[PDB]
């Protein structure tokens, strides 16, 4: 049961920085209002 607790630990630990790099990709990439991007935004929005 303990090693499963430590697995849950490392899981939460890595998921945190995953969400970090997630929110950090957001501001520079995609639906943020930066360029024209004529009607292409759907592809990147769907990958998001």
């Amino acid at each position: 049961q303990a090693i499963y607790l430590k697995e849950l630990k490392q899981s939460i630990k890595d998921f945190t920085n995953q969400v970090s790099i997630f929110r950090r990709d957001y501001e520079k990439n995609g639906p943020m209002v930066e360029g024209i991007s004529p009607a292409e935004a759907m592809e990147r929005l769907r990958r998001f």
Binding site: I36, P38, A39, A41, M42
Partner: protein, 96 residues
């Protein structure tokens, strides 16, 4: 996307296919786009794609009754002439 891909689903019907004269299935498509304009207004934010869509389907309140009778067999190539000249548009000058 939806408004645009419907606008593209109709761009190719020929004069025998597209009935635009007095029972106009495509002016009925234009009334469908009139209710598409009834759903157009949204004040969340102004987007480039949003104003592109708006430029595609706006001021159709004058298109709605303009061409319903402008497409009858009433309109003979002489009436196409009259249109091109009095409207001073080279559109029907180049294609009556």
């Amino acid at each position: 996307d939806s408004v645009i891909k419907n606008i593209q689903q109709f761009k190719e019907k020929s004069w025998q296919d597209v009935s635009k004269d007095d029972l106009a299935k495509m002016e009925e498509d234009a009334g469908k786009y009139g209710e598409q304009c009834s759903r157009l207004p949204k004040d969340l934010k102004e987007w480039q794609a949003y104003r592109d869509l708006k430029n595609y389907i706006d001021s159709l309140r004058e298109q709605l009754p303009l061409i319903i009778s402008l497409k009858k067999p009433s309109i003979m190539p002489r009436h196409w002439e009259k249109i091109k000249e009095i409207t001073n548009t080279k559109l029907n000058y180049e294609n009556p």
